[PDB]
């Protein structure tokens, strides 16, 4: 049988869909079909995002793969909460109890706090903006009542501070750094934390620094065989077919999508041995009726994609029963003289850097 | 005239002030006619479908609330649908169309007061479910002010963080000893909140919300500390005088939270919003959420009408000076500055937003 899944990309997500696609071919298995309905659209507009979950809601879809944004998310966890679709998703992760969303991206705060620590930092910038959501925000304010750390937190979205952590988009570094540099104020002085799991992603490292320290995280480890092989099948794709690929490196967005195609895979091939039906039919449904009366698999689809274990680009995928990815590492990565390099890792179940 | 008027459970005083302004700006030329439904505001689902129901009725307006959580639902389907929704609720941080926002921005009264103290060092307790939009306006002007700042979040004080708060605090209240205290957090919170850090005399708070005067001000108690805040709402203007005369008498079970000396700076504002939406619609069944879907937007041209004739009112309410920018901002509005003397609660100064410091009063 077919099983019918949605997915929702924003507009210009080209190798976020390559890597969805990829994974489809490669996760294909006999005992069923994917059939997905792909919508592109603007995730801040909450609106477009409503007309377009309940689109997928009215075709039955068994599933919805896709990305928010702040603006976006609450709607999401509402509708998914309400209706019992499972929502899985690349994006942000959010501290927030929030059922039927299976959140693919690990939480950066501990690791972020565990670097601060083990540079010894008490007194830093944390320069933000808000498309991620608070959550570090206040984690950083939390530990520094917590620490007696000295903070600067400025929304970017004459001082002696050298220690600044970048948790912005991936424009606002480059403006934030020019500015450093140029100052000549003890250019390589400065010690810069990128605050996300890409330190190897697009040009961050196109960025001149200037000689100063330079800190990130990295959620795709190419020493990996797994990474490498995939790579390797990856850098010769026909970047017409497959736009955004024929690249050496993949964007963790684009690593945890197909990570996303095999968590499906998986929990789609579990209820189909527990004899839960998976393909049914038929009839739209109202996204707004009233009552709004809910699905009965949904609670099992939920249950089989958080039960879900597997090893994929972005390392051991494994959630708690809030769809929260746990038992994961993140490797702590430093920009030195000959190219990025991995220094240690922190893991989720120790919370602590651990060096080498 | 329809139009929609969403309220939270619980919101009874508001409801009361939009039926009695209702009746007090009716005119034998016009009416009003309202379509009432009471909703979970943090459910962003449940707002779609109230909002929803609202256009399908075909409705001039809607009154309503919003937060934290479904604060994005309302400026989307507003702007997409072309809606003008108008609203006690926090004022926005961006700007978006077809949004009345009644309810004058705090943040720059607020660290107008913070300099007016001469503060640099205090805590900011804040809470995340009332939101962190004040917070961050403190947080971005400490670097160029010269501020120390320790932000504490008071939100998850029976949730799992609860060890590391009190934690915060006792190191802040009695091991740092720091005295200087902000309070950002929903007015019938400090009660709790303050009890909270009393387990002295010395310290010094400011309430950041503005009704200063609605909630509890003794001898809560404060012990003696200085205690200052922010209010819209001026029992000496002789129009806050005589509504409130009409509105101690009326009964309180025909309407909630009536019968009082004083009313709610959020009520007071849905009572002011109603004189607004008259005065801006004069001379200019059943709803279907799925209409959201179904029925196309409002063409833009009819809706900005609405949304022009709304931000042009200039009238004089229980808040003040009423004038709104393009954006539907309160402008040109006072705040008046607020200390608990021995003798209750008094105007020291006020802030303006013209000239956006705050000014002594003798
Ligand atoms: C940067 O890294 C160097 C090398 O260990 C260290 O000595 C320095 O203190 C770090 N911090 C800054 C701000 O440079
Ligand atoms: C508000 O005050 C400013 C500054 O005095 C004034 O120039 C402006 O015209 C006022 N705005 C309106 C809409 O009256």
Same mark, same amino acid.
């Given at each position: ?19 969805? /696609? ?36 009215? /075709? ?16 999401? !966890? ?26 693919? &991206? ?5 690791? #972020? ?13 944390? #320069? @933000? ?10 984690? *950083? ?16 979205? #004459?001082?002696?501070?050298?220690? *600044? ?24 002085? @400065?010690? @810069? ?39 390797? /099948? ?17 964007? @963790?967005?684009?690593? #945890? ?14 209820? &189909?041995?527990? /004899? ?52 994961? !590492? ?18 989720? *179940?120790?919370?602590?850097? *651990?060096?080498?």
């Amino acid at each position: 049988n077919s099983i019918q899944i949605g997915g929702l990309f924003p507009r210009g997500a080209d190798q976020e869909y390559s890597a969805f /696609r990829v994974g489809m071919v490669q996760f294909s298995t006999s005992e069923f079909r994917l059939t997905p309905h792909i919508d592109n659209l603007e995730v801040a507009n909450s609106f477009a995002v409503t007309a377009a979950f309940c689109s997928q809601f009215s /075709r039955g879809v068994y599933a919805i793969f896709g990305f928010y944004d702040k603006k976006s998310v609450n709607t999401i !966890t509402s509708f998914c909460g309400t209706l019992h679709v499972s929502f899985i998703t690349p994006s942000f992760p959010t501290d927030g109890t929030h059922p039927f969303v299976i959140q693919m &991206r690990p939480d950066l705060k501990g690791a #972020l706090l565990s670097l601060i620590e083990y540079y010894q930092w008490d007194k830093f910038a944390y #320069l @933000y903006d808000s498309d991620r959501g608070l959550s570090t925000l206040q984690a *950083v304010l939390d530990s520094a009542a917590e620490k007696k750390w000295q903070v600067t937190a400025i929304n970017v979205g #004459l001082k002696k501070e050298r220690r *600044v952590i970048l948790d912005c988009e991936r424009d606002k570094v480059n403006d934030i750094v020019d500015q450093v540099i140029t100052i000549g104020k003890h250019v390589k002085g @400065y010690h @810069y934390i990128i605050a996300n799991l890409g330190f190897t992603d697009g040009d961050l490292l196109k960025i001149q620094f200037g000689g100063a320290n330079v800190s990130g995280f990295q959620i795709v480890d190419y020493d990996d065989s797994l990474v490498s092989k995939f790579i390797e /099948r990856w850098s010769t794709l026909e970047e017409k077919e497959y736009p955004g690929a024929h690249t050496a490196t993949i964007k @963790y967005t684009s690593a #945890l999508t197909y990570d996303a195609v095999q968590v499906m895979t998986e929990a789609f091939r579990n209820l &189909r041995k527990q /004899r839960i039906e998976i393909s049914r039919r038929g009839n739209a449904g109202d996204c707004l009726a009233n009552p709004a009366v809910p699905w009965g698999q949904g609670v099992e689809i939920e249950r089989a994609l958080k039960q879900v274990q597997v090893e994929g680009l972005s390392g051991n995928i494994k959630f708690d029963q809030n769809g929260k990815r746990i038992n994961y !590492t993140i490797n702590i990565m430093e920009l030195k003289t000959n190219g990025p390099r991995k220094i240690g890792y922190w893991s989720e *179940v120790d919370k602590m850097v *651990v060096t080498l």
